[PDB]
Amino acid sequence: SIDEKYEAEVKKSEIDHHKPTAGAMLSHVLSNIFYEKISLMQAGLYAKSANYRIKFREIALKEDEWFYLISEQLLDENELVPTTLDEFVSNHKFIENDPKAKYWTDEALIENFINDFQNQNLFIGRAIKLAQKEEKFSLELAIRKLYGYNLSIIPYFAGELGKTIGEF
Amino acid sequence: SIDEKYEAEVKKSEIDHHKPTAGAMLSHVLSNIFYEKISLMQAGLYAKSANYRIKFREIALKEDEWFYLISEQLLDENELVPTTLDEFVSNHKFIENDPKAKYWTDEALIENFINDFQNQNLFIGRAIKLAQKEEKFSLELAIRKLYGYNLSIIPYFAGELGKTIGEF
Amino acid sequence: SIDEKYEAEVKKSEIDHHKPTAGAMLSHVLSNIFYEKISLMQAGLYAKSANYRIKFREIALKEDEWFYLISEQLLDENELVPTTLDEFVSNHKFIENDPKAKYWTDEALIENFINDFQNQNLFIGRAIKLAQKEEKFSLELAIRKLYGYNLSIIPYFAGELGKTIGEF
Amino acid sequence: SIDEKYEAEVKKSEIDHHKPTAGAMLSHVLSNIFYEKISLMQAGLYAKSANYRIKFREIALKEDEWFYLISEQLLDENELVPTTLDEFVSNHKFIENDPKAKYWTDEALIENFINDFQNQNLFIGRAIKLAQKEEKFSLELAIRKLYGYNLSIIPYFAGELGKTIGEF
Amino acid sequence: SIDEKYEAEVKKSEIDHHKPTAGAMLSHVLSNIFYEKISLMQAGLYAKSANYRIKFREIALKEDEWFYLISEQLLDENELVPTTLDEFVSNHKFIENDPKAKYWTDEALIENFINDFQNQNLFIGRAIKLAQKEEKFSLELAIRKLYGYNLSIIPYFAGELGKTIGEF
Amino acid sequence: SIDEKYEAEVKKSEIDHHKPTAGAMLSHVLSNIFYEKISLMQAGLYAKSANYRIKFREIALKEDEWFYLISEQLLDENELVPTTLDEFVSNHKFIENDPKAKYWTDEALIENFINDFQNQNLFIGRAIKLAQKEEKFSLELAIRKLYGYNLSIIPYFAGELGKTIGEF
Amino acid sequence: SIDEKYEAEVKKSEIDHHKPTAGAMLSHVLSNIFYEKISLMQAGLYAKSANYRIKFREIALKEDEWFYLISEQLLDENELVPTTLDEFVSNHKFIENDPKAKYWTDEALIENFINDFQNQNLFIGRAIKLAQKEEKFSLELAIRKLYGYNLSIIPYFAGELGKTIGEF
Amino acid sequence: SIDEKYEAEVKKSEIDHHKPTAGAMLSHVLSNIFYEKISLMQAGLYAKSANYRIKFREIALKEDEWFYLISEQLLDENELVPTTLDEFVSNHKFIENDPKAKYWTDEALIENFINDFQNQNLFIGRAIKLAQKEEKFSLELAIRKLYGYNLSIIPYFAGELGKTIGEF
Amino acid sequence: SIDEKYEAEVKKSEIDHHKPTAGAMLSHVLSNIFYEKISLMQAGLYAKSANYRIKFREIALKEDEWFYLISEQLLDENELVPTTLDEFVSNHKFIENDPKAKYWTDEALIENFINDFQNQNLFIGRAIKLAQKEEKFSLELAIRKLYGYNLSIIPYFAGELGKTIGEF
Amino acid sequence: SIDEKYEAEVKKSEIDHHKPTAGAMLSHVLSNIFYEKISLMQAGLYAKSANYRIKFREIALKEDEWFYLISEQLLDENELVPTTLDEFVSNHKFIENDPKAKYWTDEALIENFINDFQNQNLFIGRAIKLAQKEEKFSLELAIRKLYGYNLSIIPYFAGELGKTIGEF
Amino acid sequence: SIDEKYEAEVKKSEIDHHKPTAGAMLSHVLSNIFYEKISLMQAGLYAKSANYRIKFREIALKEDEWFYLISEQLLDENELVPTTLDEFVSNHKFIENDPKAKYWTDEALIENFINDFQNQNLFIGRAIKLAQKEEKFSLELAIRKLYGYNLSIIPYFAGELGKTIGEF
Amino acid sequence: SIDEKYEAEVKKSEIDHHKPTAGAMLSHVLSNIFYEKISLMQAGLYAKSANYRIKFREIALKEDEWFYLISEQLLDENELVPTTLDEFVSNHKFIENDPKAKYWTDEALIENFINDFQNQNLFIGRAIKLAQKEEKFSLELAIRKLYGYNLSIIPYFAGELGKTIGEF
Secondary structure, X not given: OHHHHHHHHHHHHHHHHHOOOHHHHHHHHHHHHHHHHHHHHHHHHHOOOHHHHHHHHHHHHHHHHHHHHHHHHHHHOOOOOOOOHHHHHHHOOOOOOOHHHHXXXXXXXXXXXXXXXXXXXXXXXXXXXXXXXXXXHHHXXXXXXXXXHHHHHHHHHHHHOOOOOOOO | OOOOOOHHHHHHHHHHOOOOOHHXXXXXXXXXXXXXXXXXXXXXXXXXXXXXXXXXHHHHHHXXXXXXHHHHHHHHOOOOOOOOHHHHHHHOOOOOOOOOHHHOOHXXXXXXXXXXXXXXXXXXXXXXXXXXXXXXXXXXXXXXXHHHHHHHHHHHHHHHHOOOOOOO | OOOHHHHHHHHHHHHHHHOOOHHHHHHHHHHXXXXXXXXXXXXXXXXXXXXXXXXXXXXXXXXXXXXXXXXXXXXXOOOOOOOOXXXXXXXXXXXXXXXXXXXXXXXXXXXHHHHHHHHHHHHHHHHHHHHXXXXXXXXXXXXXXXXXXXXXXXXXXXXHOOOOHHHO | OHHHHHHHHHHHHHHHHHOOOHHHHHHHHHHHHHHHHHHHHHHHHHOOOHHHHHHHHHHHHHHHHHXXXXXXXXXXOOOXXXXXHHHHXXXXXXXXXXXXXXXXXXXXXXXXXXXXXXXXXXXXXXXXXXXXXXXXXXXXXXHHHHHHHHHHHHHHHHHHOOOOHHHO | OHHHHHHHHHHXXXXXXXXXXXXXXXXXXXXXXXXXXXXXXXXXXXXXXXXHHHHHHHHHHHHHHHHHHHHHHHHHOOOOOOXXXXXXXXXXXXXXXXXXXXXXXXXXXXXXXXXXXXXHHHHHHHHHHHHHHOOOHHHHHXXXXXXXXXXXXXXXXXXXXXXXXXXX | OHHHHHHHHHHHHHHHHHOOOHHHHHHHHHHHHHHHXXXXXXXXXXXXXXXXXXXXHHHHHHHHHHHHHHHHHHHHOOOOOOOOHHHHHHXXXXXXXXXXXXXXOHHHXXXXXXXXXXXXXHHHHHHHHHHHHOOOHHXXXXXXXXXXXXXXXXXXXXXXXXXXXXXX | XXXXXXXXXXXXXXXXHHOOOHHHHHHHHHHHHHHHHHHHHHHHHHOXXXXXXXXXXXXXXXXXXXXXXXXXXXXXXXXOOOOOHHHHHHOOOOOOOOOOOOOOOHXXXXXXXXXXXXXXXXXXXXXXXXXXXXXXXXXXXXXXXXXXXXXXXXXXXXXXXOOOHHHO | OOOOOOHHHHHHHHHHOOOOOHHHHHHHHHHHHHHHHHHHHHXXXXXXXXXXXXXXXXXXXXXXXXXXXXXXXXXXXXXXXXXXXXXXXXXXXXXXXXXXXXXXXXXXXXXXXXXXXXXXXXXXXXXXXXXXXXXXXXXHHHHHHHHHHHHHHHHHHHHHHOOOOOOO | OOOHHHHHHHHHHHHHHHOOOHHHHHHHHHHHHHHHHXXXXXXXXXXXXXXXXXXXXXXXXXXXXXXXXXXXXXXXXXXXXXXXXXXXXXXXXOOOOOOOOOOOOHHHHHHHHHHHHHHHHHHHHHHHHHHHHOOOHHHHHHHHHHHHHHXXXXXXXXXXXXXOHHHO | OHHHHHHHHHHXXXXXXXXXXXXXXXXXXXXXXXXXXXXXXXXXHHOOOHHHHHHHHHHHHHHHHHHHHHHHHHHHOOOOOOOXXXXXXXXXXXXXXXXXXXXXXXXXHHHHHHHHHHOOHHHHHOOOHHHHHHOOHHHHHHHHHHHHHHHHHHHHHHHHOOOOOOOO | OXXXXXXXXXXXXXHHOOOOOHHHXXXXXXXXXXXXXXXXXXXXXXXXXXXXXXXXXXXXXXXXXHXXXXXXXXXXXXXXXOOOHHHHHHHOOOOOOOOOHHHOOHHHHHXXXXXXXXXXXXXXXXXXXXXXXXXXXXXHHHHHHHHHHHHHHXXXXXXXXXXXXXXX | OHHHHHHHHHHHHHHHHHXXXXXXXXXXHHHHHHHHHHHHHHHHHHOOOHHHHHHHHHHHHHHHHHHHHHHHHHHHOOOOOOOXXXXXXXXXXOXXXXXXXXXXXXXXXXXXXXXXXXXXXXXXXXXXXHHHHHOXXXXXXXHHHHHHHHHHHHHHHHHHOOOOOOOO
């Protein structure tokens, strides 16, 4: 019954992945954010300029908020939410911490972030799509607004590397 | 510079996690507070009752700032601080995650949580004397408080179950 | 141009109601928000736990301010808004007043409020759909905030019964 | 038992109404607030001037406030409070809703209310007196404020028709 | 002279107590607030549920507020106010402290207070009446609020034992 | 017509004054506030101690507040309010202005006011009583606060001369 | 040094008034601000639109706080300030009280308030000039804030008549 | 780099203002909102009545931030955004300025303003479907709202004239 | 497990009191804070300068919130807290109530409050020391905030006598 | 009459320019600010560093505020205000937008601003002068404060090009 | 560059402290305000009474911002501003420090302080005309105010001693 | 007696230095902070980057606050506090202003500060020590927190010179 519910969950879990389910696809979207918290707190602590130092922390909150809301909205519509260290490493994709990062130059810290922020917006990009289809009215509109933040983070980061987003 | 300072850290790491520095015993605390958020953040999403749901999201927020502040007093006292997944998984001690805890009763997450925090304090009750020896002055204050905070969560949790602190 | 203004309205309302427009479903939505306020208030006075008495009021307040929101959005797009006891009784569907719910329990109350709210969403969701077609661009946006709020109230209720959305 | 309770209830309302009681009086008072809330909400949607839309909304907000206020007061003295639509319809008095009134001029809405709030006031004033008799010490304090509020709203309105209270 | 004053004082208290005075009555009122403050403070330290700890503290805070309030009121009318422990012990009435009660259940603390605030109320209500008689115009206004506050706190508590005021 | 109105006005003031009316009484009350405002403003400019300058200004501010307050109250009951200088001079009573008093000591300003506020109070108290008689339900509530405010300001002042109310 | 303090003052005031100083014009300025407050208040109670009743009060408030400003600035530079009904009637010029303005219209009111304010500026502007010569450095600065406020009130009034400054 | 990218923009400009991109149809909207401020900012300085004066300065403020935010969602979705006088004068459509409008009645500026905004929406009702096609996700939300905002200004303006939205 | 819970407590309290623990000194500390509140209140009502009446209240407020602080910190570390009139009279030391201090002077009051506070610190300081040994890490930290507050009150008092700490 | 007022305005307008009129000279001062809005919003949008990005927007508000106030103060003293796109380009002088500016380096954006901010302060410099002469008491002091902002903007901008204003 | 510009300053310093620039006469003011803080900051630590203690810490704060703002209007008007110990000790004039003033009566520090500030104004009453000549426009305003601020501290101080401003 | 207390002070003063007295050692700690105010206000005024410009001012406050608190806490425990320009230069050690500093590069301004902030933390380092020994409970904990600020200032300043504190 306790154990019954958990196998039943995990059977349900990847049957749901493998025929793209809007939520299971956001299980990917979520764990990245979780990972990015780690990379961005690092960035706030061991990075160098005060300005970029704080903006990292700033984003480490807002990400933790996007986690919370998106999770809740998944969970309001009765869908499985990734909620543990096994499920996060296992269900993440294309973002990484990296011990070495403490002695990178900022430019290098930031360069990382510009890229693996675009790398967040792909599963988002089809998130979103599986939303409109599934008719997940509430969830969808919340995820669009995620794009924006994910997205607006870039040009901030870009002009910090005094250039344009038309490059990346 | 790149992969050299990383072993002047990683070796000094496992040498000091032995004849114990202050910031090593702490590297376990900091590393618990990381594991801990997740079990809370978990409970704050899954708990049957809405009071607890928010207490958890609140103890969580406070954890993810106890992380920030203990850290900032190490970085400040030129010492090592954990920062990546891999650093956390080696030095986490008695703290846990669980995909199976979603299905526990609210009663349980409290009890479990009572232990998790009792345990934080073994390592902090040491933090702290180590900081008392090394005469790292500012840091003593911040460690003392966190032992406090943690101490009070315990009876908060104790009373929800309808017992005293006296048992646990 | 006097009593004339009126017969045209009841006629265009009944007509609009069968080959059904966004407006005319919302008619039911707003009429039920009205009835809801009433039960919520009643619960806001007579419920037995204070924590629940407060939430019952938090909600009834929100219910007013959704009612105002929708209705603006509506007549911004020149449609008829129900406005008066007669309109709210003939257009309301499946939501009850019952003068002895003051004798039921907080549970019995919360129980029924989940039924109420499920039923509420049927027509939101209807219209929702009716809003996409009619290219009521600022209104659909808004009716999805409703769909969702309602959803958050229903799990909020579920866990106060000690339950997951699942059973409802 | 539930039904044991309800019939004692209804028997008593009738006993108390006819050899009149502070609560009984205040049951039409409250019913009329409930009606007022609607005519006000209608006018704060459909009236022409924005100055009057906002005021009318302000007055409805406040009636709700007065509702909760007088009701808890009465509850504290173990008194019955009209809580459902079917209680509000039986016990209301001289306040109407009119679907036609959306088609009225601002000047006639104002003028209509001068009347309602005036009529509201003759139950209030009677009530006021019973509360004294019945030594309901904190109830009386409250009704006197309701009385006063209606008087401030009457010459609000009187001055908006460029007249003076004296006329009406 | 100092002692000239004090003995006039004590003689008068006794004259005023026995052919009773608004002030005299209010001297047990105030003494009971002073006692209440303690039982409340005890329960807001030792009670099990955090919801009740915070409430109990809130009620003690407020009793202090009511203390200062009623006292300055009485001072303005040149009246004697109990100010010391030895005045509080003589003039208190039906409120006890119990060191044992830390070992009581929340349910019995709640229940005990229902009783105190009820008993507090029969001096208040008597007082209320003398204030009128003695034409103490702004004093009366005040005691009526104290009376009401106790009534709101009684069914606060009654609903927390899942009952209704009517019982007690 | 304008002049039709004014002479009805003045005739009535005289009828109402002599077989005395709550409004009539309150017309000297208000006149004395108007005078008070001046002596207070003078002392809050010319007094020596900054502690007394600020207090005196605070008391003038508040008299203005009480002015507007009592007046609208009276307006709501369709009553005449003294509004001009020539009404304030006829109807004032025992409050003076003195250009000499800028040359007084703080101690004698304080002392002078003890007197004014005392005298203010015997119209207020009379007024208070008529309001009752005349069943002016929200007026009475108000005057009682004015009465109380003057009493709090009297022993404010009494304690500033290191004495106690009892003396004056 | 007693009644002596006074004759010197009336003599130095009359003297200062003819070969006229900044002080002695301000005497008229402050005395008119006083009279103004009175008419504004009267309008703040009796005017017919509420929007105008509020502005009439906004202003009278500002009029108090200019009166205080000027007067500080003044006696900061050791000059005599009018302070008392006798000073304010003998030094006031061209500003009226009139007990039947409560019967005129908002327009008739606003009309006259433009006349009033124009006249006010004559003496500000006088003194202004008187302040430049006397090298009253902090006072002139301040009297120009007055000149202007007054100016904003006069067009404010002009447009509520439906007009440009031009016609006045 | 200098004068080369400027035609890779200016030519891509007039090619896309043809087979329409999202950000081109918008370049007209953004370009209206620029023209619009000026006619408002105008009215906010010249209007006969002080209510309108502020509504205009407020719709103005909101326009000059609708500019900022639509822009920031283009810059973000690497697209062109207008920015100089010359860009605005070519792409402004049906929007106007006028030195002669100072002398209009307040009535007129409302009517005129009703048109200006009706017109904004032709181009936004297109904005928007173009954004719906290109699957520019974040931007859809922001365009939808602005169609809303604009939609509500219309009936605000309609009711000031004493008509419904139904005409315009 | 009933009345048993109690005898164990009085026995472990008396035992703990002789070979004295941090807990058992604090017992005296808290019991004196209690007595202090009482005298401070009394002074907060009867003192003669208002400035002193306010500070006497500022303090008594702080005294409550130290009492709560200490007591938390305490039972966080499972120790017994005095809680009830009997505990506070048998454990209090050297701090007085005296019903005729209302007749002494502000000076005579302040004088004695320095004696009171000196005496208070004796036991804080004791325990303080008792807290260092018992490794009550979060409690000692806190008892030093007390030591100091008390110290600031004593010079605050010294200078209101016109004196330096020196003479006390 | 409508057309009569506009020729009459324009005849008056340049007769007023050509014999320097303080206001007509500020008609120049104003339009620059208007132009600078355009150049600075550009700067906020398409520039690169976050810090300088925002400070541009910041100044685009404050300029829009200087527009507003200065305009109002002109307009209080009955003087013509530039209030349209024809009058702004026609009556500006020595500031320019420049499409190309989107791809300038910041240094280059900023370099522009330092210069054409000095270029604002010349007509200001003689603004100011025509004020003192015309005796425009209110206007003058407002324009001095404009200097400061215009002026303090420079050294901000200067040290951003790590240098001194003693250069430019 | 290094030791060359320092004499193009230091010589221009002593040449301009002769045929006086604005910013030289000020260099003495700025240099007083530095000395002044210290005697205040002193008094704010040592004064017998707690009112004065805070007035001083407050005048102090205000001084240490009058320093900041006068400075920022020089730096802005490319002029020299004092900044080091040695600059201050040469140009301080009549201002003082004293280790012996700790033991003065509160009376004395007021009197002394009255002089210190009377003296500030000789140099500011000159500041100011120098700024009036050089047509340094913004700076005139700021100097005028400070003469004001200083002017008002004087009578604040005068009245504490129980005299008028008229003596000092 | 006045002169008696000052020799007696200075005899006491260096007897206290020369056998390290915790307070006399903080007399050193204090005067540096005082000196640093001078160096940091300089830095805010004549430095170049806006960011580092303000952070200097920020620290000039916080230092002035550390002065205040630390002083007070010394002074609560009856110890001599440095409180004058003679005692500050005489009792400082190892921090210096430097006229030349106005034309240093920021890097050079900052480089200074990093060093002579470590140079503050040495006497602090043994401050602190003499505290624990002397048993100065309150003082100690305040000084630890000084370390932190002094300390955390460094890594801010360090990463501004894009490096680590492990260098300096």
